[PDB]
Design a protein around this ligand. Structure first.
Ligand code: HEM
Ligand code: CYN
Length: 149
């Protein structure tokens, strides 16, 4: 499972390899996959949607699915994960951008951080359900997201 504390053991070449092949298709169909992830997130975690002003009034899966607002936002989420994927070998680059995102989330949007690991789990389920390699990358992501709190 995905954790947002402690430290993560380094990825092995096998992990890196599978993360990359599983990520590919999700990224290339971002306009579709991105929406799916958000719909899934908000229907199972309704508390979380309140932290999103732009999505006020979208009360159904169908409404979420068809809102352009959700689509544009979702692409920014995919692009950020994609940045992490692309940077697995360069801890200094990876970290830098995530630390930045962390600061924005705590001081700018002021979100409750308990949800980072919940969203990250919807992403892992979408990309490759139960893959241990993918869950580690997602855990590194969550740790870093919590860094500015
Ligand atoms: C996997 C974890 C997540 C990633 C990769 C992520 C990524 C992002 C990105 C890339 C942005 C845009 C930053 C910018 O405009 O410069 C953003 C904004 C935002 N995020 Fe996250 N996020 C994550 C989790 C969450 C969660 C769980 C919440 C709610 C609890 C949240 C709430 C927000 C809000 C409210 C905004 C601003 C929306 C707006 O007004 O445009 N994020 N996020
Ligand atoms: C931010 N989702």
């Amino acid at each position: 499972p995905i954790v947002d504390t402690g430290s993560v053991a380094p990825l092995s070449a096998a992990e890196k390899t599978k993360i990359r092949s599983a990520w590919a298709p999700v990224y290339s169909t971002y306009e579709t996959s991105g929406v799916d992830i958000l719909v899934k997130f908000f229907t199972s975690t309704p508390a979380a949607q309140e932290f999103f002003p732009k999505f006020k009034g979208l009360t159904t899966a169908d409404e979420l699915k068809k809102s352009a607002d959700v689509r544009w936002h979702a692409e920014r989420i995919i692009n950020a994960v994609d940045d992490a994927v692309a940077s697995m070998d360069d801890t200094e680059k990876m970290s830098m951008k995530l630390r930045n995102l962390s600061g924005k989330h705590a001081k700018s949007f002021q979100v409750d951080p308990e949800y980072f690991k919940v969203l990250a789990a919807v992403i892992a389920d979408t990309v490759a359900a139960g893959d241990a390699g993918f869950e580690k990358l997602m855990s590194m992501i969550c740790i870093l997201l919590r860094s500015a709190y």
